[PDB]
Design a protein around this nucleic acid. Structure first.
Ligand SMILES: Cc1cc2nc3c(=O)[nH]c(=O)nc-3n(C[C@H](O)[C@H](O)[C@H](O)COP(=O)(O)OP(=O)(O)OC[C@H]3O[C@@H](n4cnc5c(N)ncnc54)[C@H](O)[C@@H]3O)c2cc1C
Length: 456
DNA sequence: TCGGCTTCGCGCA
DNA sequence: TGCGCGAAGCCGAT
């Protein structure tokens, strides 16, 4: 459908029909940004061909009640900035509240929409809304992958066992799908308050806030400023200051050597394709570039592949057969310690290192990448059953991580607990053949005491 | 029917 | 710290 700098493989049709004479509506869910957004560019290209304006619709659901204020304020503040950025391009944004299956369908009929476009997400709840919208609309419905450099349905048609099988498939498609973004052209034709939604949401989540002994909040909101503009600043500082020594110090939690882009990446406030574009052009350590590109291209987009082809990505069934047989055999093994969800959540275990990892999660909303493996693996070792460990790790990850409720989180937890995208290791009690990590192993790789002292 | 697996632990410079 | 090996199951190039 038209376009020169426009790869049609990024867009697929969800529902055919006659294109109405109304504006093209971009249903924005995952990629909350105005720049480097294929879904917004496709909505603008379609609207240009039909001489109609383009509008953006965001639907606020009740899913914010399952998370904390840290995620709600981070997303809402970025949406207010996004509202001004879209208005400067004469693109109006409508914020609806309620069920997307009921509000999007009612919006299309009331606004006399002609074409519906949405971004892609492999999560289960996103597909449920899409099937409901299809049953309530009669206009064409398109889906755009604006989150991955290579479209998730294009990179692989099946669940990928390991990276070394998915790695050649991704890099072989990079010369085609890695490209600069065209500028978002403003509109020619022009035709709820977010401040009120922010206040109403905060008062709803206030009783569930994570508090200290003196009733002081644990979350520190000054570490990550939300927004499309602030995401660009973080990307620039990583390339200039941190990309060089990323390869050597990425597994040292005592050193702030990560990109810190996951909160913006999860909410779509910055495009991973843009970051890869800037990283590829940077003249930095070749080993560091390969290590970072492997994370933001292979492991990030294999997480989408995992969730897209495994609808039970958050369940014990999604684990590989060897891992399920191993974990089932050790269900009766006596655990050295048993902790409940409340004790895990408050950092009340015998391991100071694990407690320090949980403290970083509660206070900053972003636990270090290396400690997230030790954090999740120890949960498996000190829980009743593999089902309980999976439930507890997912519950804490989605509640307190700014990047939680993400395909990376479910793939990351499945890797740590079920060995997904991993292999078998030495046989052990309780954990079976799943990859093992120990406190002593952390002591030889980084200064464990410094990490503990930083977070009590 | 082999070769190599993200990110492992461990012994040894 | 940095390096080589161990312990393990399996995909995929043939
Ligand atoms: C148990 C566990 C839970 C995790 N929880 C989440 C989560 O809720 N949300 C989330 O986005 N990621 C999660 N991660 C994946 C990864 O640890 C994070 O992307 C990373 O810690 C975020 O910090 P960073 O962007 O500064 O890291 P960087 O080293 O700068 O990573 C760069 C980018 O690459 C991607 N990436 C890096 N590591 C991984 C990985 N192991 N798997 C997939 N993609 C990766 C992310 O998009 C990340 O922003 C989790 C991993 C594990 C093992």
């Amino acid at each position: 459908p038209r376009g020169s700098h426009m790869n049609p493989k990024r867009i697929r049709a969800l529902k055919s029909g006659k294109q109405g004479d109304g504006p093209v509506v971009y249903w924005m869910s995952r990629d909350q940004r105005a720049e480097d957004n294929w879904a917004l560019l496709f909505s603008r290209a379609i609207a240009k061909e039909a001489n109609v304006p383009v509008v953006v619709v965001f639907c606020l659901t009740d899913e914010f009640l399952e998370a904390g204020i840290r995620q709600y304020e981070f997303m809402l503040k970025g949406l207010q900035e996004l509202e001004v950025s879209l208005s400067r391009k004469k693109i109006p944004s409508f914020f609806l509240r309620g069920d997307p299956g009921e509000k999007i369908s009612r919006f299309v009929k009331d606004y006399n929409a002609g074409t519906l476009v949405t971004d892609f997400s492999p999560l289960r709840i996103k597909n449920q809304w899409i099937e409901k919208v299809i049953s309530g609309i009669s206009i064409p419905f398109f889906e755009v992958d604006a989150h991955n450099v290579v479209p998730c349905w294009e990179a692989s048609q099946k669940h990928e066992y390991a990276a070394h099988t998915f790695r050649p498939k991704l890099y072989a498609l990079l010369p085609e799908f890695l490209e600069e973004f065209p500028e978002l052209e403003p509109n020619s034709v022009t035709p709820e308050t977010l401040s009120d939604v922010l206040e109403t949401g905060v008062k709803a989540l206030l009783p569930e806030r994570a508090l200290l002994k003196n009733k002081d909040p644990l979350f520190e909101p000054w570490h990550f400023e939300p927004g499309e503009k602030a995401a660009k600043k973080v990307m620039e500082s990583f390339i200039a200051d941190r990309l060089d020594s990323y390869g050597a110090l990425r597994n040292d939690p005592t050193k702030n050597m990560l990109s810190n882009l996951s909160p913006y990446l999860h909410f779509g406030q910055i495009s991973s394709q843009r970051v890869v574009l800037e990283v590829e052009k940077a003249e930095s350590n070749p080993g560091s570039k390969k290590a970072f590109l492997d994370e933001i291209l292979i492991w990030k987009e294999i997480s989408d592949n995992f969730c897209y082809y495994n609808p039970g990505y958050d369940g014990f069934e999604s684990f590989p057969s060897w891992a399920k047989e191993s974990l089932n055999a050790h269900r009766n093994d006596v655990r050295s310690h048993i902790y409940t969800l409340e004790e895990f959540e408050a950092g009340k275990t015998h391991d100071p290192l694990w407690n320090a990892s949980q403290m970083e999660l509660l206070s900053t909303g972003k636990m270090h990448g290396y400690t997230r493996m030790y954090w999740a693996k120890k949960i498996l070792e000190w829980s009743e059953s593999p089902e309980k460990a999976l439930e507890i790790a997912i519950c804490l990850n989605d509640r307190y991580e700014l990047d939680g409720r993400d395909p990376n989180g479910y793939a990351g937890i499945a890797w740590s607990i079920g060995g997904v995208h991993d292999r078998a290791w030495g046989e052990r009690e309780v954990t079976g053949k799943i990859r093992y990590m120990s406190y002593e192993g952390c002591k030889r790789k980084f200064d464990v005491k410094l990490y503990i002292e930083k977070y009590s």
